Amino acid sequence: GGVQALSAWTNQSGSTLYIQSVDPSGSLSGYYINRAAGYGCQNTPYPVTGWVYGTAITFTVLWENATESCNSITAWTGFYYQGQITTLWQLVINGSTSTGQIISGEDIFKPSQQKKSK
Amino acid sequence: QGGVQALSAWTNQSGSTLYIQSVDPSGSLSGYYINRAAGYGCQNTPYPVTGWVYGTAITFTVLWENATESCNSITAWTGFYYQGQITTLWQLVINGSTSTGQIISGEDIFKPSQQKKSK
Amino acid sequence: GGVQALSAWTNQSGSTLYIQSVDPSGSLSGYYINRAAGYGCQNTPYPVTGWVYGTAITFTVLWENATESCNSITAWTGFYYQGQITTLWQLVINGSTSTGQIISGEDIFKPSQQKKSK
Amino acid sequence: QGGVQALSAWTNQSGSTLYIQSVDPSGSLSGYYINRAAGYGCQNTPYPVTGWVYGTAITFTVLWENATESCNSITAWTGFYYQGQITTLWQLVINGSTSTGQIISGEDIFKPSQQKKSK
Amino acid sequence: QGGVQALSAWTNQSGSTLYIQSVDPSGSLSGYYINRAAGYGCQNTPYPVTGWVYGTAITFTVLWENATESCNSITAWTGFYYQGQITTLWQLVINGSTSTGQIISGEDIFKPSQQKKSK
Amino acid sequence: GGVQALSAWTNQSGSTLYIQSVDPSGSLSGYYINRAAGYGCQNTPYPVTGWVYGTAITFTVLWENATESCNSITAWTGFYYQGQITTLWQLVINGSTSTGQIISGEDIFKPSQQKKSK
Ligand SMILES: O=C(O)CCCC[C@@H]1SC[C@@H]2NC(=O)N[C@@H]21
Ligand SMILES: O=C(O)CCCC[C@@H]1SC[C@@H]2NC(=O)N[C@@H]21
Ligand SMILES: O=C(O)CCCC[C@@H]1SC[C@@H]2NC(=O)N[C@@H]21
Ligand SMILES: O=C(O)CCCC[C@@H]1SC[C@@H]2NC(=O)N[C@@H]21
Ligand SMILES: O=C(O)CCCC[C@@H]1SC[C@@H]2NC(=O)N[C@@H]21
Ligand SMILES: O=C(O)CCCC[C@@H]1SC[C@@H]2NC(=O)N[C@@H]21
Numbered sequence: 001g002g003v004q005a006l007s008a009w010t011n012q013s014g015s016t017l018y019i020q021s022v023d024p025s026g027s028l029s030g031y032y033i034n035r036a037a038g039y040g041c042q043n044t045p046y047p048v049t050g051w052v053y054g055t056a057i058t059f060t061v062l063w064e065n066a067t068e069s070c071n072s073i074t075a076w077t078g079f080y081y082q083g084q085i086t087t088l089w090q091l092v093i094n095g096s097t098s099t100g101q102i103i104s105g106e107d108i109f110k111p112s113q114q115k116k117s118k
Numbered sequence: 119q120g121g122v123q124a125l126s127a128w129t130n131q132s133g134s135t136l137y138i139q140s141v142d143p144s145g146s147l148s149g150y151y152i153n154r155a156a157g158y159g160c161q162n163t164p165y166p167v168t169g170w171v172y173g174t175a176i177t178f179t180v181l182w183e184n185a186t187e188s189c190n191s192i193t194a195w196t197g198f199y200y201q202g203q204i205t206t207l208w209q210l211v212i213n214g215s216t217s218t219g220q221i222i223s224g225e226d227i228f229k230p231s232q233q234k235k236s237k
Numbered sequence: 238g239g240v241q242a243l244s245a246w247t248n249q250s251g252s253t254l255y256i257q258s259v260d261p262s263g264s265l266s267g268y269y270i271n272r273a274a275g276y277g278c279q280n281t282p283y284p285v286t287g288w289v290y291g292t293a294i295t296f297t298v299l300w301e302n303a304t305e306s307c308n309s310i311t312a313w314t315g316f317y318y319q320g321q322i323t324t325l326w327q328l329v330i331n332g333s334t335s336t337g338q339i340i341s342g343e344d345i346f347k348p349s350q351q352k353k354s355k
Numbered sequence: 356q357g358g359v360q361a362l363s364a365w366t367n368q369s370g371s372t373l374y375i376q377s378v379d380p381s382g383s384l385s386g387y388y389i390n391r392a393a394g395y396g397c398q399n400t401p402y403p404v405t406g407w408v409y410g411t412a413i414t415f416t417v418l419w420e421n422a423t424e425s426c427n428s429i430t431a432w433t434g435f436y437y438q439g440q441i442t443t444l445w446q447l448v449i450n451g452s453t454s455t456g457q458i459i460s461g462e463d464i465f466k467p468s469q470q471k472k473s474k
Numbered sequence: 475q476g477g478v479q480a481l482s483a484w485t486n487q488s489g490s491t492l493y494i495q496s497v498d499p500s501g502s503l504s505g506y507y508i509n510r511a512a513g514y515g516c517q518n519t520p521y522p523v524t525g526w527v528y529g530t531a532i533t534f535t536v537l538w539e540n541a542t543e544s545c546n547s548i549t550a551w552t553g554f555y556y557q558g559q560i561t562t563l564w565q566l567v568i569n570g571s572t573s574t575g576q577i578i579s580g581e582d583i584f585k586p587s588q589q590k591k592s593k
Numbered sequence: 594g595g596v597q598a599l600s601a602w603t604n605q606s607g608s609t610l611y612i613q614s615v616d617p618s619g620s621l622s623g624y625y626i627n628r629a630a631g632y633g634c635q636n637t638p639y640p641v642t643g644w645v646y647g648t649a650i651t652f653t654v655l656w657e658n659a660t661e662s663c664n665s666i667t668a669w670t671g672f673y674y675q676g677q678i679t680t681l682w683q684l685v686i687n688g689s690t691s692t693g694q695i696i697s698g699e700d701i702f703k704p705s706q707q708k709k710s711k
């Protein structure tokens with residue numbers, strides 16, 4: 001447990017980051033399920049791009065999937081430290097007109113370990 | 119326009135959903151499957167899809183390995199868009215198999231889901 | 238000899254799968270030469286996408302290259318076992334209207350080993 | 356057309372420039388940052404950008420590691436195109452950090468640069 | 475339209491063929507080469523092409539390594555589409571070379587092949 | 594020091610190749626800064642694609658970035674030998690009409706090593 005290729009992280013509001021691939025250049029690829037009260041784009045998967053560099057991570061999701069659109073983007077900035085990813089996020093809405101319309105917060109993502117099945 | 123687009127979602131009768139994110143010019147298909155089918159591994163979490171669109175023809179395959187749950191298998195669907203529906207035959211192979219007889223068969227019919235473009 | 242990145246497999250009807258790349262996520266990339274009596278899209282290369290997971294493999298080719306089109310897609314499902322990939326395939330034709338128009342069969346791909354030259 | 360295009364370059368007030376090479380259909384953004392900001396590591400060499408465009412919304416993040424100079428950090432900008440300008444808030448995390456308080460904040464306003472299509 | 479397209483095939487006078495699968499918006503070229511040139515390694519099997527289109531300008535390079543046969547070399551062509559033809563100069567480098575004098579030169583002229591869109 | 598993923602090479606005319614990624618198939622990805630007297634498309638980054646195979650390398654840049662266009666492509670062919678990449682390059686201009694309009698030359702790229710900072 002650093003920040004692995006094929007890891008799953010769940011924040012305090014129930015949402016989950018599926019990192020499926022971190023290539024050698026540090027480039028990240030995954031998808032996000034939002035379960036956060038009061039927000040759109042819940043319960044379906046959206047694509048994640050970002051970067052990893054040691055314990056440092058950025059990732060950003062576009063809120064336009066096949067089932068639902070919220071005309072917005074989020075970008076987390078954060079770090080892996082003692083079994084958690086602690087992040088600060090910023091959310092722009094399309095058509096915004098000042099940095100005052102940008103919404104801010106903090107998510108602490110705790111891991112979930114890989115079950116085997118069938 | 120109608121048919122198999124980028125940014126289209128399709129739910130089968132077992133309640134599972136194919137999220138098509140992207141179709142290249144190439145034909146290349148990329149997306150997520152969420153499995154919600156009674157009796158199976160790997161439900162309620164999303165898994166990567168690769169495949170191919172060609173008018174109404176479509177293949178797409180899912181690797182059952184994400185970071186919350188793995189099922190040591192791959193499914194490949196093969197099908198066509200016909201009447202506001204995608205009609206597929208699927209085959210499912212389990213890691214370690216030694217006989218084609220161990221490859222499992224089914225049929226899924228995917229109907230378009232409700233795009234709710236609002237916050 | 239598992240199912241390798243950079244391997245070449247030739248079925249009973251003479252056709253050949255060139256797997257050039259299997260990334261760590263298991264995602265497969267290659268190209269197919271069809272030599273199967275009675276079929277279109279013979280003797281030129283078509284692109285392959287698929288997945289590998291242990292000895293389990295899917296791959297699918299679109300039958301539209303630069304020289305020739307057959308308005309169809311094939312998808313194999315199969316497994317590596319004692320120096321062979323044994324597969325069942327299904328072929329849709331664009332504009333199909335029932336699952337009865339879908340053609341089925343079995344290919345056993347045997348390997349070929351890498352010659353050095355110049 | 357105007358707005359956030361493929362093949363558009365944007366210089367902030369510290370004199371740094373975002374080179375946008377490609378926006379997919381997807382929304383996906385790919386490009387280069389050259390940092391020219393007084394006081395920082397990793398100036399005058401280009402670094403990879405990933406991110407996202409959505410009308411006037413835009414995120415983009417830079418990994419400060421190319422082969423001439425590395426700074427053991429990532430920056431993520433978040434912003435919008437408004438009046439022939441992209442207005443961003445950035446956050447910067449250093450490898451090894453243990454407190455959100457160590458994440459650093461700023462604001463960049465990027466104005467379009469001069470495209471000189473000639474040899 | 476005519477010129478260097480996606481989904482275009484081009485055979486040179488030695489009988490070899492460039493299969494262009496995809497040109498991005500970017501300019502990026504992706505495809506297969508089959509070498510059919512008397513006297514060489516690596517014939518009759520397909521090899522990956524990367525490169526670049528820019529109106530009538532075009533580079534494209536082939537790595538001579540697929541799973542049936544490898545030749546420990548790379549070829550890079552450089553050329554232009556002019557009169558229903560692509561006219562190229564190629565350079566070929568062998569792994570292990572120590573002198574530019576060991577880089578080999580030729581000229582290929584590729585004429586469009588016959589697209590037979592039927593089953 | 595072979596030809597690495599994450600290496601930087603600077604030729605005799607001051608230009609620099611940033612190789613950020615060489616995948617296992619040998620496929621190369623990077624970007625070029627031109628500092629060569631008498632040429633367009635100086636001082637900004639252009640995208641590189643190519644191939645590596647032992648000490649053999651090809652790479653090609655399209656001269657169309659966000660800030661400046663020169664309606665041209667270059668392709669180097671060359672090899673790594675005793676801490677240098679020695680190359681021969683060929684430059685086509687869009688709309689060229691004979692192989693006589695194609696410009697030729699030789700670049701010897703010497704390495705630069707990775708500084709740490711902040
Ligand atoms: O409502 C929207 O515009 C799209 C969904 C936003 C969800 C936000 S992103 C930051 C925070 N973290 C979550 O897990 N959900 C919310
Ligand atoms: O190996 C497993 O059990 C997990 C994947 C199985 C889900 C199958 S795939 C075909 C069928 N159609 C669905 O919607 N789900 C099941
Ligand atoms: O005729 C077509 O529609 C396109 C070519 C189909 C070739 C099929 S795919 C399954 C089988 N395996 C081969 O090697 N060739 C045939
Ligand atoms: O870690 C470092 O010092 C190197 C990168 C810092 C450059 C920063 S990122 C945000 C700010 N805006 C710029 O244009 N450059 C600085
Ligand atoms: O190293 C080898 O011998 C295999 C590749 C050589 C094929 C060359 S590349 C340039 C020339 N043009 C062709 O059509 N084929 C040859
Ligand atoms: O002027 C142009 O058409 C675009 C820039 C060309 C620069 C050439 S490419 C070969 C040579 N090597 C360099 O470093 N610069 C020149």
